[PDB]
Each structure stands twice: as C-alpha cells, then as structure tokens.
Symmetry: D2
Subunit: 726 residues, 4 copies
C-alpha cells in the first residue's frame, strides 16, 4: 500500500472550508448531493477502488512500468500493444478549444421558480413552484485560451444549461447587459481585433493592444460595452459576485399565443464585487486559476453560488416606446424604465467529477429554446443561431454531440436522424423517415398547445426588401455610454479613467490613442480630458465643444448600473489572512475566529514558514501558507493578532503583505503590539477609517472589521495610496 497508514490522503466527504482538505471530484466530496441530471450521469461514471488495471479492451496489465523489448537494454518491439494503446490515447487527448470563451469553470445545481408564470409563458420549467430543474453552469472569460488566466480584464460569460422536461434550454449570457457590435456578420472582425494579433499571437487575455483599440476607434457602436469592460465590471472578485444578463430581447409566449418581449437577468445573492486593476493583474501571476479555485472551494465549503433569475418584460405594443431600439444589442434597458421582475432561484451545489468530460465537452447554444420562448430579429442574436450548432462539428467531432453525457437531455428525445461519427444511440425503429406506414408513423409530430405541445414560431409580421442594411434606429452610439458613466460613483469613474489610460498606454501607434480620445469627447468631456491628461494629449477647441449626447428617456442616471452606489454586501464565504507570529496572544485569536465563524467568513493562518507555531498558552497553531505563498491578493482583509511582534516586525514579506493589502483598499485590523505595523503603511496615531485597531481583539474590534468587510473595500483610502511604494 502506497497510501499513508493514517488515511490522510483521502479528503473528508463533508463540507469543509477552503484549504482544510485537498479538493476532490464532486461525487466523492459530496456523495449525498443529487438531482435528476446527476442521477442520469451515473451510467457513465467509472470508479477505481479495488479494480485491476486493464487495457481499454479489458485485458489485465501485469507490468505498467516498462515497454516490451528484446532484452532489458534492447529495442522496443512493435508487438507491444499495451504500450501503443496507452501512448495512442495520450497522443490524442486534446480537442479544439472553444473559439471564444475557451477559459471557463463549471458546476452542477438546480433551479426552481418562485411561482407559476403560466400567465406570461407556457415554458414548463417555469410552470410550477415545485418543479425543480437541474442545471449545469459554465462561467468564462472571452479572449484567452483554455490555459489563460482567470482575473484578466475581459467580459465574462455566464451560460446555464437547464435540463427541462420539455427539452434543453441554454441561457447563454454575459456579465454585462450589452455587446460590442450590432450585427453578427462583424463577429469575426471584432473577435480577431481583440484576440492575440496574428503575426506573433500576442497578447493573451488582454484588449490592451493596437488592433483592439483600432477597431473600437473605427466602430463607435462598441463604446457602450468598452465602457463596461474598462470599469471594474471587467475584473470581478468571484463568479459568485457578478451580474449576468441574456444580452438580447427574446420572447415569452403564453398558452393564448400572446408574445411578451423579455430580457434575462441573473442577480448574485452574494452581492456585486470586483477587484482593483493592480490587484487583478498581479493575481493573474500569483494564481492564474483564482476564480476556478474560488468557485470549486465555495461549493466544497457549502458557500453555494446563488443567483436570482429576473425578467425585464415589455409588452409587444411598447416595442417603439423608447429612445433606442429594443433589438439593438448595444443598448441596455434601464431598470429605472423597466424593472426586473424576480422569477426564481438557482443554486450551484456540486462540482464535476472530471473537468474534461463535463466542463470542456459541454456545449451551450442560445438557439436551444423550449415551447414558451421564442427569438426576435436582434441581428446579433440572429447570427448567433447559426454559429453555436456549426462550431460543435469540429470542436466535439460531429453532429452526435448531444450524446456526450453532459449534453444529454433528461427529457425524451426520438427522431429519424441517424449515423454520424461517435454514434451512441442504436435505433430500433424499422423507419428512418416520415411519413412512414411501416412503424405507424412513430415517433409522431405533436400539435402546439398549452403544455407538452410541439414548438411553433410566433407568427411575427415580416415586411421589407432583401437588404444588407443597418437599421437607422441603431445609429446612435454615445448616449448609453454616457448614462453608464454618469451612473457610476466618483471612485468607479476614476477606475474607468485609469482602465482606458492604462490600455491606451499599451497601444504603440499614437494616432489610435488620439482617435479613441476623440470618441470619449463624444460621450463625456470630463472622462475625455482625464484620459487625455494621462496620455499627454490635449483636447482641441472643437473637441472641447462637442455637444454631449441626449439623456436616455429622460434619465440622467440609473443607480442599478453601478457596482457600489447601492450597498449589497455579503460577507459569507469571504476570506481573511491572519498573520501569525512565534508567540501569538491566544485570547486575540480565539476572539477573531469565533466572530469570523459566526458570519461564515474563512481564515488562513500565515507565517514565514510551514509547520506549526505555539500560542502564549500552549495552543498549537497549524500554518496554511507563507506570506509569499498566499499573498494578500487572495484574501478580502488582513488581521494581525498581538504577541511576539518582534518575530515578524522586520520580515520584508510580512510588511509588504500589509502594504499590498493597503494599496488595494482592503480592511486591515491590528491588535495590541501589531499596531507597530501602522508605521509601515504610514497611519497616524489617532488612526484612520478602514484600519481597525485596539489593545485586544475584542469588545467591538471584530464587529468593526466585519462592517468594513460588508462594504467590500475602503474607497476613502484612494487618495492615500499613491504615496505608498507597493
């Protein structure tokens, strides 16, 4: 036996906090979690304990350490079929990655609606508050490869596969409510522009290069989503703390045949929260897997990601009631004008077993709708419909990609399609065509109806010539960017300014920078001048005099557009670094952890080495990581207990830990002598808002620190950070 005698190789099969155990496949970690889709994948799960090692043909292998050779120092023989089978399978492991959104992280869960929505849609999964629908959700970036970093600045994808009793519905959304372009014909142009440039395949996971900003400067329609990307929306703290949106107007269709326009929303119940750019960028270095790791560890802890589905609903007769076109995917519908109606809750509660099989192979596509839903003429959605089926023929090897286990419906599926590469289903129908008499015409068409009926498209009126032409109604580019900008807090605005300024600084051809500055002067002069100043560019007198664009339906802001204007903080599942010394005051640490536990906040105990240290009173404290090993980038706040402060007082890494956390606007708490660290971050003796301090770690010390955590970051600190060399 190679496993240790004490069984410490095997993670506890129960919820445990991040870092407490090694992570495990989902069905081993949480065998008791189930849903209809997880149960149906059982026929393909393969175990391993107590089984013999075999070839793929079921032949037991005796020696899996050597090739067959003619003498022990001789040549390898062609008749070694065990070697070639094993090396062949390895040689062909990889499949093409996704053209876009290649990097992503996925989990199983379930959805349930709060009440029946049968008055507005006949979609079965929304018909009964008792109906529970398994889901599989993949979150992603957009630009980088499957091996790129998580905490890049980019749009994020948010795709949900609903396994409904009337078919798969895939809601394939992003973490912003619009897109860069209006018509799908330009998708390869915009994507090529943002992707690594074609001569040298640089840069990875970044829009900060010439071709991106060239395209933007030439295509003002892009400005609305570029504003979102340049804001902190572009660098979420966690997939659990970003919004999701369905991007387009779709339709709900009720049993009476009435159509209502809809835009889809996901509200994060853990609240909205993003990193700051210096932190996000350094974190792509320190842990390029941070979001994938965070999601997996949240689920293993029982901090299940939760989202509320919501609908913006517009009656058909209100199609033309706004200053913008409902079909224009560069326009958002402000919540001040059309509120989000809550629809149901989704909980992600189980990790996959095998990332390749379940995550890499999963295929989501927004054309996968069910009776009760329908499309509109949004010309970006229209062309999406072609792409998501097509692309699977190479990516997943052919047209039987719905037979890959994760992609399988739980609903019945029967039809007359046959063959193709990989074919799993063995059809026994005497007929492979309809109409047929030889199988009494089964499987049979089903008329549409209120439930369990066939799909019929809503009979929308179509009138016009065959044209390749953009609707004039789409030809307004600045008003939405302006509403977004005006809706942001002052510190959010500063981070937008800094996003543009940093990205344009990496554009080598200056004229491209100048051109983008001109576009910003069409949105807001303050923004434009602020960027210009950071680039050494001076606005012309004409630029100074560009009339700002109109407000959007009388609105001069909408607070729902800001990450932070309206507090929605949640501390459960956040993490604190605790900086240990070689004689910690135990009474501080008891008080710290008691208060963290009661709010579901995690801790990591850090020191200058691994192993353990011992508190003032004999308590043995195990160390999770070194200061260098688990940098402040990875935590939401830092607490330093009292004790032998001299131990770490001249430790470069320990000082720098507080400096980095300070720069990134994180709450910091110092008890007793740990107040000696106030010198390293230049804090005055009377103290400052965002630095919690006291003789000991209670009465109200932990409450103060937890209040600061609920507000995410200490925005007031921004004017002090430039002075700090970190």
């Amino acid at each position: 036996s190679l496993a240790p005698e004490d069984g410490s190789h095997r993670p506890a099969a129960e919820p445990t906090p991040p870092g407490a155990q090694p992570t495990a496949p989902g069905s081993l970690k949480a065998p008791d979690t189930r849903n209809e889709k997880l149960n149906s994948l059982e026929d393909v799960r393969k175990g391993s304990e107590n089984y013999a090692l075999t070839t793929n043909q079921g032949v037991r292998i005796a020696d899996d350490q050597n090739s067959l050779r003619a003498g022990s120092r001789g040549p390898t023989l062609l008749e070694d079929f065990i070697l070639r089978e094993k090396i062949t399978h390895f040689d062909h492991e990889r499949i093409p990655e996704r053209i876009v959104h290649a990097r992503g992280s996925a989990a199983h869960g379930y959805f349930q609606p709060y009440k029946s929505l049968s008055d507005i849609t006949k979609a079965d999964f929304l018909s009964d508050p008792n109906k529970i629908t398994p889901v599989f959700v993949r979150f992603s970036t957009v630009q980088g490869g499957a091996g790129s970093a998580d905490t890049v600045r980019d749009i994020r994808g948010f795709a949900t596969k609903f396994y409904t009793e009337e078919g798969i519905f895939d809601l394939v959304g992003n973490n912003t409510p619009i897109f860069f372009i209006q018509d799908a014909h330009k998708f390869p142009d915009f994507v090529h522009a943002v992707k690594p440039e074609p001569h040298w395949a640089i840069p990875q996971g970044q829009s900060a290069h010439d071709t991106f900003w060239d395209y933007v400067s030439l295509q003002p329609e892009t400005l609305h989503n570029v504003m979102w990307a340049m804001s902190d929306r572009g660098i979420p703290r966690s997939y659990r703390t970003m919004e999701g949106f369905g991007c387009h107007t779709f339709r709900l269709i009720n049993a009476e045949g009435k159509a209502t326009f809809v835009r889809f929303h996901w509200k994060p119940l853990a609240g909205k929260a993003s990193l700051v750019w210096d932190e996000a960028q350094k974190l792509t270095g320190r842990d390029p897997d941070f979001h994938r790791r965070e999601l997996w560890e949240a689920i293993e802890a029982g901090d299940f990601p939760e989202y509320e589905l919501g609908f913006q609903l517009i009656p058909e007769e209100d199609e033309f009631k706004f200053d913008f076109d409902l079909l224009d995917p560069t326009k958002l519908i402000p919540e001040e004008l059309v509120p989000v109606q809550r629809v149901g809750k989704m909980v992600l509660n189980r990790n996959p077993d095998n990332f390749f099989a379940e995550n890499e192979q999963a295929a989501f596509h927004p054309g996968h709708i069910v009776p009760g839903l329908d499309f509109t003429n949004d010309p970006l959605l229209q062309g999406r419909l072609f792409s998501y089926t097509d692309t699977q023929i190479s990516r997943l090897g052919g047209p039987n990609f719905h037979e890959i286990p994760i992609n399988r419906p739980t609903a019945p599926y029967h039809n007359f399609q046959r063959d193709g590469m990989h074919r799993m289903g063995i059809d026994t129908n005497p007929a492979n065509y309809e109409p047929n008499s030889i199988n009494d015409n089964w499987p049979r068409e089903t008329p549409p109806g209120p439930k369990r009926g066939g799909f019929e498209s809503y009979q929308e009126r179509v009138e016009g010539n065959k044209v390749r032409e953009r609707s004039p109604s789409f030809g307004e580019y600045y008003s939405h960017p302006r509403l977004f900008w005006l809706s942001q807090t002052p510190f959010e605005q500063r981070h937008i300014v800094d996003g543009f300024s940093f990205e344009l600084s990496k554009v080598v051809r200056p004229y491209i920078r100048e051109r983008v500055v001109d576009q910003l002067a069409h949105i807001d002069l303050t923004l434009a001048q602020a960027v210009a100043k950071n680039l050494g560019i001076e606005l012309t007198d004409d630029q100074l005099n560009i009339t700002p664009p109109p407000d959007v339906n009388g609105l001069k802001k909408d607070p729902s557009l800001s990450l932070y204007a309206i507090p929605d903080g949640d501390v459960k599942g956040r993490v604190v670094a605790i900086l240990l010394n070689d004689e910690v005051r135990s009474a501080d640490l008891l008080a710290i952890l008691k208060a963290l536990k009661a709010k579901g906040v995690h801790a990591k105990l850090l020191y200058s080495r691994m192993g353990e240290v011992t508190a003032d009173d004999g308590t043995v404290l195990p160390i999770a990581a070194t200061f260098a090993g688990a940098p402040s980038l990875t935590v939401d706040a830092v607490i330093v207990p009292a004790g032998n402060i001299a131990d770490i007082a001249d430790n470069g890494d320990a000082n720098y830990y507080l400096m980095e956390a300070y720069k990134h606007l994180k709450p910091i708490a110092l008890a007793g002598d740990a107040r000696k660290f106030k010198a390293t971050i230049k804090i005055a003796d009377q103290g400052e808002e965002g630095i919690v301090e006291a003789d000991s770690a209670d009465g109200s010390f932990m409450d103060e620190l937890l209040t600061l955590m609920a507000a995410h970051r200490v925005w007031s600190r921004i004017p002090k950070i430039d002075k700090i060399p970190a």
Copy 2:
C-alpha cells in the same frame, strides 16, 4: 399516413422462411434471443412507438413538413433551428469506410468450447465447456467499397470479436489459409495494386486489371493466394459455406508457461460451397446484396450460421521440422501433416438492430489478444499489430473507439487514460497516473498467473542484428501453389484455368499476361499450357523444360484443400425456385413442399406476374417474385410442377430460367407435362444425371432431387454446357 388495419406492415417476431415477412432489426424480430453482450447494449437501444418526434435536444416538433419562412412563398429564415439541426445531422452522417474490407455483413452469436483446453492454454474463454462467450462476427470482401457487390471474385474476411471475461479477443481471419505477401511493409503496395487504379478509379471489386497482374508477375510470393482467388474459393455461395483461417502462426501459453504454436480454423457446419464464375458475376448485377441478404434471412429463418473452431498445434521443438517456414504467411500447413483439432462451436443467432451503429462502427484488430494467447515473429502479423489501432483514429474519430457500444468489453476496464474526442466515461478516480498514493494506487497491476492474471509476453529468445532483410527460408514460391493445384478435382482445375484466363484477358498490356503465364510454368506445365492456350500464347521450349517445384514434405496432394473432393453437403437453409402455372397440380406441390420442409429447404414461388394464382383444388398461391425478378442465380435448384404447362411453355423468361440454371450446374426437377421443357435444355428421353423427372412429384422424385442438392452442383454436366446459348 398510417399502418394498414390488418397489421401486415409488422413482421412476426418468430422464425420465418426467406421472403415470408419483411426483414426487421434483430431485437424486434427475435426479442427473446439474448446473450450478455446483447443485453449490455440495452443502455443505448432507442425505441420509437408512442414517442413524440423531437429535436436532439428533446424539443417536440409540431411541423416536420416545412421550413420556417417569411410568408408561405417566402425565403427560409436563419432562426429555423429545427431545420438546421436536422439538416446538419444529415450532412455529417458518413464516416470514412475501412481502407480494406469496406464491404461486410455482420451478426451476433455465441461460442463455447467442447472441452477445457487448460493443458495447452490458460485463455479463460477456452477453459470450461459451459462458459458461453458472446461474439459479434463480420464477414467481408477485401477490395471494394462499402457500396460494392457481394458475389465478386475476391478473398473474404471473417472477423470474430469474442467478448471474454478476461477481455476482448478479436480473431481477424480470411477464407483462405495464406496471404499474398510476406512482409507488412509491402501491404500498401499490394493493396494499391489490387484496388481501383489511381488515375480513373476502375475497376471496383475486381483484380482483373493491369496493376494487380503487374504486381503478381513481379512478386512470385503472391502466387499461392492468387491460386486460391482464381479457384472457386474466390466466389463463395454464402458466408455460411466457406472456411475461415487465422492466416498466421500464433502461440497458446498454458499455466505452466509452455508455448505451443497454433494456426486457427473455422469449419462451416453447413459445408463448403461456391458459385461458378458466370453466375457470380451476373449475380453482382441482379443482386449486389446477395450474401448480405442471405446471411440476414438465414438468421431470421433459424438456419443459424454455425462454425467449428479448430487448431493446428505444433510443439515449440517442431518449429523447423517442415520444408517451409512456420512464420511465412504465404505457406499453409497441410492438414495431412498437422491435423485440425476440434475446439468448439460458434452459432450466429441474431442480426443487429442498426447496421451503421453496430456493423459499420465495429473495430476488430488481431492485436486484441488475452492471457493464454501470444504472437509470433510472422513479419506480416507483426506489422498488422501497428495498423489496426492506428486506422481507428480517423475511421472512428479518435482514441475512444472502445466506448462505441458494439466495441465495449463486457469484462471490466479501468485505467489511467483520460480525455480524447467524444469521451463517454466520466472517471471519478482522484488519480490519473500511477504509481499514486492518493487513490492507494488503484486501479492496480495484477501479476500473471493461471487465471485472471495480468498479461505477460512469452519470453521468446531474440538473437540477430537490426536488419531489413527477408528470411532466406521464405524464398520459395512455387511448391504451395502446386500442392494446391494438384489437390483440386478436375472440374476445380478447369475453373482455376478459366479464372486466370478470364482475368488475364482484361489485362491490356500483353507482356504482363506473358509474364504471368511464365510464372504459371514454374508451378505446373498443364495449368500453364491451358491458360496460354486461352490467351493465344505459345510456351517456349525453355518454358516447357522448367522443373516442377518439389513436393511439400512428400505430399502429392491434400484433399482438404479441395472444396468438393470429400463430400460435406448440408441442404438445410438452401432454397429452391418453384415455377408456377395458372393451374398448378396441388398434389405435386403438396409433396414438393412436404419433402423440402422435412430437410429445412426453402422455396420461392415464381410466376410471370405478381399477385396470386389458384391451384387445381382452389388453393390460393401468393407469388414471391416474377421469373425475371428472382432469377435462377439466387436459388440452388429449380422445380417445375405439373398443371397448365401451356400457360408457361412459350414464356421466354420461364425457358431462360431453366437454361440459366442448367448452364450453372444446378439440379432441375420436372413433373408431368413440365417434362416438355426438356427440349429447351436438350435432355434426351432416357434422361440425364442431374435432371429429375417423373409423371408426378412423389417420394422418389423429391428424394432424388434432394440427393442432387446435397452434392451442390452437377459437375458431370460441364461437357454439355458449352453449347447452350445462355
């Protein structure tokens, strides 16, 4: 659009004679026929009755007759996802056909040994007379595409997949005991030479063209398997009536570690039988699916194909005891020298459900062996071990071909291989490598041993330098062709002469024909002269003086090489045409059918139109096919009962039917006034051996006819057929 009220669209799920019912998928025809493999496919069998028609995503379809368009005479819309899925699946149905053996027909069955073979092999499937091993067998031609004809002149493949408890064993053999070439390196040269020529891709299914004869004339090693192909072995009557062979010397390994050399045989329990060339060739046009159809209908009728597995066993110390090299696959082992020992019986008793999913995607490969079996250094076998795994990567789309249902072992398989395109198995093992401690090293290696052990290669001694060199012991090319020739009956020899003469006559470059005749002069002067004569070639004096090759270890002939020299007829499963008239003598038909039924011989009732005729006693006789629709090619014998013979006496098709049957040496029986047809085929009043005649069809008349059928064809008639214009 539905089934007839009378239920006549659906075949009875009971054994029925050929033509009595429409044919059907195996699981619907014979639902009670099971074996472990057939059952294990139930996870993927898909029914159809009572199910709604859906997309692959499980969405019910309301209208499967129309595309979505803007107005009912308008353009089709890109949002029609139902159309695009349906069309996309169709557009990608085809996969690459097999490089060789693309044309093939398959069925399920089972194998069991007669007695334990544990003294000579530890192979589990040969260890116990009561352990039943499921099989899937595919029979094939070699050269032609998957849509080429069955009754071509060609070698046939005979591949058997044994789903044993210790893994898949594939015995991938052919219907002759040798191959054309000695070293695998030459396989692409030989296969290119026999395949359609590269400029124009002609001819299909035929070696009768310049490149094949060019290669043969230049590579005398090919002459043995050429002799077999030119004989009637090249044109079997049925896959049920040909022998199978394993082609190479393999090894059996017993529990004690003792190696025995083995060559594998399959003996057809229905006996050995072939077509004649004019019949075979004409039948590729009248029914290019004849062998496929006959196999399927034999299984539906209960005439299950049965084969006896047999081994030629040579002790290790006897490796060098013959005058040929055991490892040379152009040499056969004569049964006079090494008898075939009967080992067990294989029964094919169920057709597949879906030809594509089970037949076309099946992957057989002779490197798929199990403990108790091993290879030899046969240099043809050696290179086959590389090819059968390699070719699957394009043909079946990747390294997960074992997960295609037909290919899956019934034995457990577990190992550390992961990913690849269309990966089905979801591995839960925390480890994907070994040695590992994190899963206590499971799944684990298994030492070799008497039963259920890991595979270990027999420790054959290897001594030699790294050389590309043919063994000098392989450099003899004429003695086996000659042994084969001398072992054939005089009529078999005439058919071989005619096959070479026909084929060479289609070689356009005359020097190639000449060079082949020179090769023939090195085998046998009589054969060489007879072919020369048909080609208008005169042998030179030198050619006339070529010393015949030596006998093979003292043998002048070996009758086991002949199809017919030793009687082994079995009429069960054969078929007779009965030519009706509009007033059949019912008493003749009663005795005819009763006698045929007693011996398991089928009948097809033929007439000059379809529908019914009524017999003299009122019996209504449904007509299977017209004289033209089911020609004498497709049957084994023809009977013409009495009655209103004037109805058909002057029918050109009825007359030709007898001329064709007569020319092709088939038994013919004529009752009462049907004796008038004697004039069409010029039988004298006295009668002729091979024509049964009498006032009525009685005991004596049917016994005689059945005795002739047990002898397959009427070879004595050959002198008389030159003259018939048919």
Copy 3:
C-alpha cells in the same frame, strides 16, 4: 482612407530596437532576409494591399458590415452565403493544441557547420562549412496550454527543424540534459501527474501541486530532472539565454559505416541567464507573453538568437 496621413501606421522595414516601431509579420519587417525554405514558402504567402475583399470562392463583397435580412429590422435570411461562409470559417478556426509543449514561440534561421564532419558522419548537412541549412526553431514550455504564461517554472523545449538536401532532420530537445523518466511507457503517468489535476483542471503552468510531488516521491528516477527544474534553470531570462540538449544518445554513422555514440548540445552565444523566482512569478501576471515578445523583438532588432 483610414490610415493616418503621416504613414505612421506602418513599421519601418529595417532593424529597430524594442518598442521603437509596432512589430510586423517577418516578410514585411525584413523582406530581404532570405533562405531556401523562406523562399519556397513564397507560393503560399498571400498579400492584401490593393486587393478586393472576397469570399473564399473569389466573389467580391460589397457590404462587409451587415447580414442579409427581410427589411433593415427583419430576420436574417438563410440565403446569406457571405455571412455563413465568414462565420463557418470563424467557427472552425481552432485545432487541438499539442498534448505537451502547447505554449511555444518560433522563428526562421539558418545553420552552417564550422568544418566538414565526414570522418564521423555522412549527414549531408554536416559535410562542408559552405552548406547552409535553413531551420525553423520552436521554443516552448511543457505543461501549460497554448494560452498559458511564458515565465513559469517548467522545463523548456527547444526543437529545430533542419531542411537538409537529404531530408528533414528534426532535433527535438529540451533545456536540461536529462528527463524525468526512464521508459516511454510511463510518459502519460508522469505528464498526467504534472498537468492540471483532472477533477478541477488546476493548476496551470505549475508543478506545485500534490499529484506531481506524489509521483516524484514514488519514482526516485525523477529526482535528477526535478533538481534542474527547481534550480533557476527552470526560469530562464530568455530563450536566447538557455542551453539546449538532445536528451538522448543517438549515433553518427560515417561513409565506412562506423557508429559513434553522440549527445547533442546547443550553447547559447548570448550566455546563460535566468530570472529569480519572485520575478518570474510576478512576470507571469505583468506580461504572460514575455519570452514570446522578447524573441520576436530581439530578431526585429538584429539581436539574432545564436547557438553553437
């Protein structure tokens, strides 16, 4: 015309130091750098200036900004073959990445011997100092995907394709003189152990995880190459400042048929140099393209990578 008046969109076709010009495809940057291989590629190079935008079938496109629709706010039509061809090609751009060494950066060059080696090998490309052999060299990491970071701690690959007059010779080496394992049958075990773990596909570009160290602790043959990886060998400054090795004993064979055992080396004429760990790790976040960028820009500058 969208280009600026002053022509400043186009980099000078002359050697320029890093950051002085935008980088460019090599035949536009250095049109007059030639070798037999670069010249033979001319049949497939495709330009662009002054040519009409077309489908792949040669049909000129009038409007590359819109899909065909029934009215300017209507549904997209299935007969828009221009849109579908364009989106089809896009949807199928990606091919599987290499199983290992997926991350790599490559350049064209040439090789020339110092003297005839006919006394020890009949290899034609080593037969005369006048024999100029074009090469294409690809440097790589090992573990991470094609979109992973350059300055990870990993072994590096150093693969050279020699286009000789008697065939392609590929010298497929790494930047340490040994490997982790002894027998090819274990390669998928070792590679699975170092690669991201299979439940959750973490970590990228790193051996710093349980399964790798598990395998190493159970397979002491690995320890030699593990020493190299854990040294600063595992974090080179530059592909220009690392060594290469052919990893195995091969043979040279001469005209007389005499065999000599050989191990191959590449000695970097720019000398040996590596990063420090803190710096390499932070650099994976500040510029995950650092070594790819540095190689391209060294070449653009005339600082050609040279190895003996």
Copy 4:
C-alpha cells in the same frame, strides 16, 4: 466540414478559384495560405483597410442581393400554390 476536414476546403487544389481571393478569415485545419496582412479584421487602419469592399457595378463590382419584396408572417407552411 466533415467530408473535407474543415473550412479550408477551397484551398484543396481542384476547388481553388482562379480569380483572386483575399479576406480576413484565418486559421482552421489544413491551413495552406500564409497571410502577410498586418490586419485580420475590418475596418482597420493599420493596413489602410485592405482588402477593401467593392460597390456593385456593371463589371468587377461586389455582390449585392436583388431587393426582392418580402411580406408575410414567420410560418412553417407549404404554399397552397404547391398543392
């Protein structure tokens, strides 16, 4: 895409146009053409927007669809005129 292995089937020699073909499409399996264009998107300034769209005209013009009038509802319906 399955029959000929990918989206570059126009580069298979028999399939190639003899007319010029230039555009911003890139990559795919079996890619033969080595594009030197600094740009792989349009609109672009870095290659002066080449290759460029061409207005329709009497000869050598870009493709424009005939502006056929469409009018009706989104239906899966056979025209009665086809019955």
